Design a protein around this ligand. Structure first.
Ligand code: FMN
Length: 144
């Protein structure tokens, strides 16, 4: 089975989170690809049993390219009933991962806890939190 970790990142912080989530999924022998939203194909979303989506927060929102990706591409992938996860890096208000999770639920996805947001640059211990989210995603995939 297969998971995909899709992200938007402006300075690398959400990207670092995404790669650590993927490392956690790999560690449980679930296939995974960690990929920027710009490069992901519709078929790759359709193929996946679990889709984790991450964005940083700019002016209290996920950035517009990610909002479009979610409203157009993710909806078109027919994700009803799939495992979802939401994450991102932020500086003080941190709305984007909350908004991502809400969008996923509206789409019919079952969003795992925790929705994971991390201030500024992830420390090593922060990246262990990310790895744990990936382990949890893999275990959820294998349980289904
Ligand atoms: C122009 C700009 C606007 C930002 N606005 C917010 C904001 O409204 N709320 C917040 O929590 N962080 C805000 N941030 C902080 C970023 O979310 C934070 O630096 C984050 O670590 C960037 O992660 P990334 O490298 O994955 O893009 C802003 C940063 C910039 C540069």
């Amino acid at each position: 089975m297969k998971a995909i970790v899709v992200y938007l990142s402006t300075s690398g912080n959400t990207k670092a989170m995404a790669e650590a989530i993927g490392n956690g999924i790999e560690s449980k022998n679930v296939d995974v690809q960690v990929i920027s939203f710009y490069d992901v194909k519709l078929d790759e979303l359709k193929e996946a049993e679990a889709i984790a989506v991450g964005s940083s927060t700019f002016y209290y929102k996920m950035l517009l390219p990610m909002e479009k990706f979610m409203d157009e591409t993710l909806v078109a992938s027919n994700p009803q009933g799939k495992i979802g996860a939401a994450f991102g890096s932020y500086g003080w208000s941190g709305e984007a991962p909350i908004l991502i999770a809400e969008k996923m639920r509206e789409m019919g996805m079952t969003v795992m806890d925790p929705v994971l947001r991390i201030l500024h640059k992830p420390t090593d211990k922060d990246l262990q939190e990310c790895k744990r989210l990936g382990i949890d995603i893999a275990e959820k995939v294998k349980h289904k």
